[PDB]
Every structure is written in C-alpha cells, then in structure tokens.
Amino acid sequence: KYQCVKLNDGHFMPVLGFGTYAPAEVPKSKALEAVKLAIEAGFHHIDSAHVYNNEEQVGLAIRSKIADGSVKREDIFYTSKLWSNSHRPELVRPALERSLKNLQLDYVDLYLIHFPVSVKPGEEVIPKDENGKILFDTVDLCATWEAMEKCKDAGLAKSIGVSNFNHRLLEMILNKPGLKYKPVCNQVECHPYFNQRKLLDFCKSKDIVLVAYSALGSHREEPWVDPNSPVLLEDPVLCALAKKHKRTPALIALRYQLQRGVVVLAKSYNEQRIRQNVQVFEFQLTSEEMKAIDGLNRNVRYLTLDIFAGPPNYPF
Numbered sequence: 001k002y003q004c005v006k007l008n009d010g011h012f013m014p015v016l017g018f019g020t021y022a023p024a025e026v027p028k029s030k031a032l033e034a035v036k037l038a039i040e041a042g043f044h045h046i047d048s049a050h051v052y053n054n055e056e057q058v059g060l061a062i063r064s065k066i067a068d069g070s071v072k073r074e075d076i077f078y079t080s081k082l083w084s085n086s087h088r089p090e091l092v093r094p095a096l097e098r099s100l101k102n103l104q105l106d107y108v109d110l111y112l113i114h115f116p117v118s119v120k121p122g123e124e125v126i127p128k129d130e131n132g133k134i135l136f137d138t139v140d141l142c143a144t145w146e147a148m149e150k151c152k153d154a155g156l157a158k159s160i161g162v163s164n165f166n167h168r169l170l171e172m173i174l175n176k177p178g179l180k181y182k183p184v185c186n187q188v189e190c191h192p193y194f195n196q197r198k199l200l201d202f203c204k205s206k207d208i209v210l211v212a213y214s215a216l217g218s219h220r221e222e223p224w225v226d227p228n229s230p231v232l233l234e235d236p237v238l239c240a241l242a243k244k245h246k247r248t249p250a251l252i253a254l255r256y257q258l259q260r261g262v263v264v265l266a267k268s269y270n271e272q273r274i275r276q277n278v279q280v281f282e283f284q285l286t287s288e289e290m291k292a293i294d295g296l297n298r299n300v301r302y303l304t305l306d307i308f309a310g311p312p313n314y315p316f
C-alpha cells in the first residue's frame with residue numbers, strides 16, 4: 001500500500017512523485033538508473049515529459065521493474081506532458097502516441113498541457129527563425145483541451161490536467177462550453193519561498209490538485225534560474241526544523257507540501273537522496289511548525305521561462 005489522493009475524475013494519484021528532468025550534460029543513462037532506484041525505494045508516481053528527452057530511458061526503467069516482478073503497471077502512476085509544438089488539436093493525439101511509443105507503454109496515467117504558450121509544429125521543441133526569434137503559434141487552448149479530452153475517452157491517458165496555468169487560464173478551461181472533464185491538476189512551481197497559497201486555495205475550491213514542482217528549490221540551472229536567487233535548502237528555519245526532527249531541509253519542505261494538501265515531486269539522481277525522500281511519510285509537522293514555514297514565503301519564482309514571454313497566454 002501507499003498514500004494517494006482521489007482526483008476529480010475518480011482516479012488516484014500517489015502524493016509523492018519522482019521528477020525525472022536533468023540538465024542536458026547529465027547523460028540520459030542516469031535517468032534509467034534513477035527511476036529504477038526511485039521504484040525500489042517506494043515511489044509509485046513518476047513524472048516526465050516529451051521535452052525532457054528521456055522517455056526512452058524512463059519507459060525502460062518502468063518496463064524493466066514490471067517485467068522483473070518488482071511492481072505491477074497499475075501500481076505505477078506515470079505522467080507525460082504535451083509540449084507546445086503540439087498544441088494544435090490534430091497534433092495532440094499524435095504527440096501522446098509518440099511519447100507512448102518511445103516509452104513502450106500502452107497508456108499514461110496523466111497527460112498535461114505542459115505550458116500554455118504555443119509554438120510552431122515540427123520536431124524542434126523551441127523552433128526559431130533565422131534570426132533566433134521563437135516561432136510562436138496562435139492556438140485556442142480550449143480546442144487543445146478538447147483534444148486532451150478525446151485522448152482520455154480513448155483510454156490513452158487515464159487522467160488529464162494542466163501545468164503552469166494561472167487563474168485566468170484555468171477559468172478559461174473550467175468555463176468552457178461543452179466541457180467534459182475538468183483538469184485533475186495544475187502542476188506548478190511551489191515551495192516555501194513561493195507557496196502559492198492564493199492559487200492553491202483556488203484549485204481546492206474547484207477540486208483541482210496542485211502538484212508542486214521545484215519543491216526543493218529547483219535544479220538552479222543557468223540560464224533558466226538566476227544564480228543570485230536565494231538557496232531554498234539553505235534556509236535557517238528549514239535547517240533548524242531539520243535538526244530538531246533529525247531529518248533534512250529537503251524532507252521538511254516535502255512534508256510541508258503534503259500536509260497542506262499538495263502533491264509533491266522530488267527529483268534526485270543520487271541513490272541516498274532518492275531513498276531519503278520517501279522518509280517524508282515517517283514524520284509529521286505541528287501547526288506551529290507549518291506556520292513557521294508559511295512565514296518563509298517571499299514571492300521568489302525560480303522558473304520564469306521568460307523566453308516565452310510576450311504572447312497573451314504567458315502565465316506569469
């Protein structure tokens with residue numbers, strides 16, 4: 001058994017997920033070994049995406065742990081994400097089908113709209129003109145969502161959701177005429193320096209699960225993250241809490257999310273930190289401790305993706 005939450009479509013999501021993004025200089029081989037370790041350690045929720053360029057490896061890990069009797073497919077919750085070069089409705093299903101072929105899985109548990117700003121169709125994830133300008137595309141996300149709904153109806157994705165949506169863009173989906181399925185989640189940056197209370201409360205009021213990424217303060221990979229930004233795991237209050245509970249600042253930060261009703265992702269390619277992260281289920285925080293963590297909030301957004309700034313659908 002393991003801790004899950006009931007999503008608004010009746011499906012269940014394990015409340016701790018393993019993140020599989022690594023900076024490109026990290027060889028892809030490490031993704032295979034890390035996912036296997038995450039499964040061995042007790043992760044039952046694995047988070048990937050087309051744009052991470054690791055689905056062949058992450059799929060192999062999963063296949064391998066099923067084929068060796070370590071786990072059953074129904075006890076893995078696997079998430080992929082529709083990249084912005086495939087927002088046009090007629091491209092959505094082929095994108096999912098391509099991810100499924102790379103993975104050699106029959107279905108994904110969750111398929112998200114990865115980012116709300118669209119770019120031109122093609123193999124290139126960030127297509128650029130001869131002058132280096134990003135090739136933006138104009139697409140109605142409500143049609144993109146209809147095509148997601150059809151992928152759910154075909155059993156290719158058991159659930160569908162969004163990522164890096166803001167209040168306006170969620171409402172756009174929720175208030176859509178002929179809406180068949182709400183998004184089960186909104187996967188966004190969330191951690192003690194950016195606790196997203198406002199958007200969290202919104203998602204709760206609509207029974208949408210907030211899934212927290214960069215819950216440990218992110219890769220801090222340049223140019224995506226300003227190396228001046230504060231180091232989450234170095235916070236004195238988190239480090240004090242960690243010492244007091246004989247845990248780590250990372251564990252405190254993960255536990256914080258679980259108790260506030262957020263599903264939390266943790267990336268690590270390190271065998272010891274992978275095993276350590278599942279200890280989030282071994283302790284609990286008091287109301288006073290949770291309030292202290294709430295006080296760390298400083299509106300620090302690490303991941304702006306501001307190369308996609310300009311178009312109306314840029315969410316930040």
Ligand SMILES: NC(=O)c1ccc[n+]([C@@H]2O[C@H](COP(=O)([O-])OP(=O)(O)OC[C@H]3O[C@@H](n4cnc5c(N)ncnc54)[C@H](OP(=O)(O)O)[C@@H]3O)[C@@H](O)[C@H]2O)c1
Nearest residue numbers: 019020021047213214215216217218219250266267268269
């Ligand atoms: N939807 C989106 O747009 C989006 C955006 C960003 C991320 N994500 C998803 O969210 C996942 C996680 O976010 P993210 O990669 O920024 O990083 P995240 O998990 O905050 O972690 C950042 C760093 O923490 C380290 N770490 C892990 N456990 C630790 C521990 N117990 N003690 C000290 N350090 C620890 C990792 O290094 P080691 O590997 O060396 O342990 C990693 O570099 C991604 O892998 C991806 O699946 C989605």
Ligand SMILES: Cc1cc(CC(=O)O)n(C)c1C(=O)c1ccc(Cl)cc1
Nearest residue numbers: 021022049051052053114125126305
């Ligand atoms: C697009 C994108 C968005 C995210 C945020 C996330 O979900 O973590 N990542 C990590 C990427 C890439 O991997 C990426 C791949 C190829 C190129 Cl050229 C640029 C970025």
